């Protein structure tokens, strides 16, 4: 199938028409997405098959065809861009200054941008075009608006 680096929509035909359940990143021959998007299921790319290779429900991440390759990190100071790929809409870069999720195990960058649930897995980029994490696992705050963690894996 298609193995070119880039952002991809994750689609399904199980429901009405063709529905976008999420997004992912192809880099170094490995497809990266959020676990809640595929639930660890196999994927199709044209005639080819992508099998899961690594996954973790707690991190909410999964990789296909090989190990997790994304290791860039938010520097804690600079603006970033969400490369949002919404259902039925063109890919679009949105620049923002991340906030912070403070946890008992440390701080994580967070992006306060609201998109349909089928946008989960869209990458967050630094100024060099490197993926520092994926959008789509977060919380709903006081006002009802959404804030996503900048979710990043570990490159072994």
């Amino acid at each position: 199938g298609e193995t070119t680096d880039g952002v991809y929509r994750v689609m399904t035909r199980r429901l009405l028409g063709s529905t976008q359940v999420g997004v992912g990143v192809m880099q170094e021959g490995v497809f990266h997405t959020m676990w809640h998007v595929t639930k660890g299921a196999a994927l199709r790319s044209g005639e080819g098959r992508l099998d899961p290779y690594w996954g973790d429900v707690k991190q909410d991440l999964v990789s296909y065809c090989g190990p997790w390759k994304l290791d860039a990190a938010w520097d804690g100071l600079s603006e970033v861009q969400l490369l949002a790929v919404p259902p039925g809409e063109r890919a679009k870069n949105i620049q923002t200054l991340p906030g912070i999720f403070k946890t008992k195990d440390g701080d994580i960058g967070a992006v306060a941008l609201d998109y349909p649930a089928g946008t989960s897995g869209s990458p967050i980029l630094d100024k060099c075009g490197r993926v520092i994490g994926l959008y789509g696992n977060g919380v709903v705050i006081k006002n009802g608006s959404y804030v996503s963690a900048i979710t990043q894996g570990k490159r072994e």
Binding site: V7, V10, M11, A42, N93, T96, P98, A112
Partner: protein
């Protein structure tokens, strides 16, 4: 059955729309990978 379709290159866009605030939130992450607000 799930399938993937290319949607673009991964590139920083000069002069992209700038939006969103930067909240500092106390959060917890459970075994199911769900975030919650700590208050």
């Amino acid at each position: 059955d799930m399938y993937i379709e290319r949607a673009g290159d991964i590139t920083w866009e000069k002069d992209a729309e700038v939006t969103g605030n930067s909240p500092r939130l106390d959060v917890a992450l459970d075994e199911s990978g769900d975030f919650s607000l700590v208050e």
